[PDB]
């Protein structure tokens, strides 16, 4: 068997129920081989708080040796394994979902086997292992993982792009969760630098992929889902940080035919407004946030309101002079992108035509984010 | 119709391409060695980027207005593709919701067990510290 059997103060064979672990949690007998611990919840509870050095060394050695020996495409051409490797990786991933941290053996294996990876053998397990990476400086970890990941990212299909975006979102969530508890105990500014660099890196990746894939909405949904998690850093984790996504993504999402994309964009804009107005009042108390972010957000909001119902679509981004429309033959352009004449709302307009103050109908259709944005903007 | 305009534009661009190729065909070849390869390539990259920036700055959005039927057909095709995109998005969202519910249940159970074990350990600590 890949996992060593359970073999032998308090005797180990008598430990069979949760109350027994509760009574003798302080004194326990460690197994001869730590591999048998990998599939035992009761021993996992004890190891959850041990932080003992020889224990960690033994576990690291055993896990690294097992992973190196059981690989399919590294150091050996052995495809006979198949499902055994997948089951072992699933067990490891389930174990590290507990303990709220990852082992160094997995990080070493990822550093070792990533360049030779093809991107199709064990995509799910590898992309789940990537999320459990210990926090470190972005500059040190970039050449080891992110270079190869970006090289593999630009030459694969759209599904690979969506999968890596999901993995990056999970990694960002884990990093934020771990950094949140630190302040309750490199300084803060030296650590926010890494997350800012990561956000800029993923934004650049998203922009390039959006350009490559000929404006596909399927990837746009994943990008917007990632930025939904990005938007609430200051509120959810009480960390001072506000980062805005590039104008390319904003102007690709605003001028899309999908209604759900518009709803998600309105929700994200409302979340930015709430976070900014919550942080501005606390800035006076803590006294630094750059104002340039404030002007960029103001420009975005101005463009949004001008395109929605203000009949002023020609903002800072859409700097289109009227002579092009005049020579083309466009007479009514002020209220052409409005709620009534927007291409995304064409279906709703046709549906309401068969049956004037139809905003309630749109809200009843499920446009919750637009309603929230309208309530937050008018008031 | 606009088809004649498109054909004329393609022909003019092909003629310009031919003239450009004829002008470019008068430059000699330059081969590299293992000792002076990196620096020469870097210099050539710098020159090419400088040329491309100026080329991109001069470009302007072309109007070339078309008819209305072609726009209608393009919109029809866009809606047709958007249908399948929406159905795939819906299926992925359903799978995500199912996984989220399962993970929520598992995390709740783990939290309960952790609370129990923490309480037991704290009671044992109090008992040992009392004696």
């Amino acid at each position: 068997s890949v996992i060593p059997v359970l073999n032998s103060s308090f005797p180990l064979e008598q430990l069979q129920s949760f109350p027994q672990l509760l009574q003798n949690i302080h004194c326990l007998e460690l197994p001869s081989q730590m591999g048998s611990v990998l599939n035992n919840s009761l021993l996992l509870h004890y190891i959850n708080c041990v932080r003992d050095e020889p224990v960690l060394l033994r576990f690291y050695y055993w896990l690294s040796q097992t992973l190196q020996e059981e690989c399919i495409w590294y150091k050996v051409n052995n495809y006979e394994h198949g499902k055994e490797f997948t089951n072992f990786l699933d067990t490891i991933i389930r174990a590290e979902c507990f303990l709220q941290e990852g082992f160094y053996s997995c990080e070493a294996f990822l550093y070792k086997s990533l360049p030779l990876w093809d991107g199709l053998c064990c995509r799910s397990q590898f992309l789940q292992l990537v999320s459990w990476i210990p926090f470190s400086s972005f500059s040190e970890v970039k050449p080891l993982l992110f270079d190869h990941l970006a090289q593999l990212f630009f030459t694969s299909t759209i599904y690979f792009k969506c999968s890596v975006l999901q993995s990056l979102k999970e990694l960002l969530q884990n990093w934020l969760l771990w950094l949140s508890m630190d302040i309750h105990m490199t300084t803060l500014g030296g650590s926010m630098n890494s997350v800012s660099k990561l956000i800029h890196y993923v934004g650049w990746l998203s922009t390039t992929a959006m350009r490559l894939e000929s404006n596909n909405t399927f990837l746009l949904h994943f990008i917007l889902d990632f930025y939904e998690k990005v938007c609430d850093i200051y509120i959810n984790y009480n960390l001072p940080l506000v980062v805005l996504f590039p104008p390319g993504i904003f102007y690709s999402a605003l001028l899309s035919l999908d209604t759900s994309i518009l709803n998600q964009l309105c929700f994200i804009m409302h979340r930015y407004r709430k976070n900014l107005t919550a942080a501005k009042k606390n800035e006076l108390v803590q006294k630094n946030f750059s104002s340039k972010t404030y002007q960029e957000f103001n420009h975005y909001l101005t463009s949004m309101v001008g395109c929605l119902w203000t009949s002023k679509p020609f903002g800072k981004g859409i700097y289109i002079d009227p002579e092009i429309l005049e020579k083309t033959g466009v007479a009514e352009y002020k209220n052409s992108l409005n709620v009534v004449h927007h291409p995304s709302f064409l279906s709703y307009a046709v549906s309401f035509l068969l049956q004037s103050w139809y905003l309630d109908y749109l809200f009843s259709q499920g446009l919750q984010g637009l309603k929230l944005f309208i309530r937050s903007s008018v008031h | 119709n606009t088809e004649e305009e498109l054909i004329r534009e393609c022909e003019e661009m092909w003629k310009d391409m031919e003239e450009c190729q004829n002008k470019l065909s008068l430059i000699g070849t330059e081969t590299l060695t293992d000792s002076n390869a990196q620096l020469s390539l870097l210099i050539m990259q710098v020159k090419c980027l400088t040329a491309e920036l100026s080329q991109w700055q001069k470009k302007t959005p072309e109007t070339i207005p078309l008819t209305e039927d072609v726009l209608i057909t393009l919109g029809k095709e866009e809606f047709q593709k958007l249908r399948q995109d929406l159905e795939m998005v819906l299926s992925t969202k359903e799978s995500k919701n199912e996984k989220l519910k399962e993970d929520l249940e598992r995390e709740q159970r783990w939290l309960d067990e952790q609370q129990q074990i923490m309480e037991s350990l704290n009671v044992l600590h109090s008992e040992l510290k009392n004696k």
Binding site: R123, S124, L127, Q128, Y159, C162, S163, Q166 | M88, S91, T92, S95, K96, K99
Partner: peptide, 12 residues
């Protein structure tokens, strides 16, 4: 899982 659904969609 989400990835299992993505894989089973990719095969077909």
């Amino acid at each position: 899982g989400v990835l299992a659904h993505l894989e089973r969609l990719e095969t077909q």
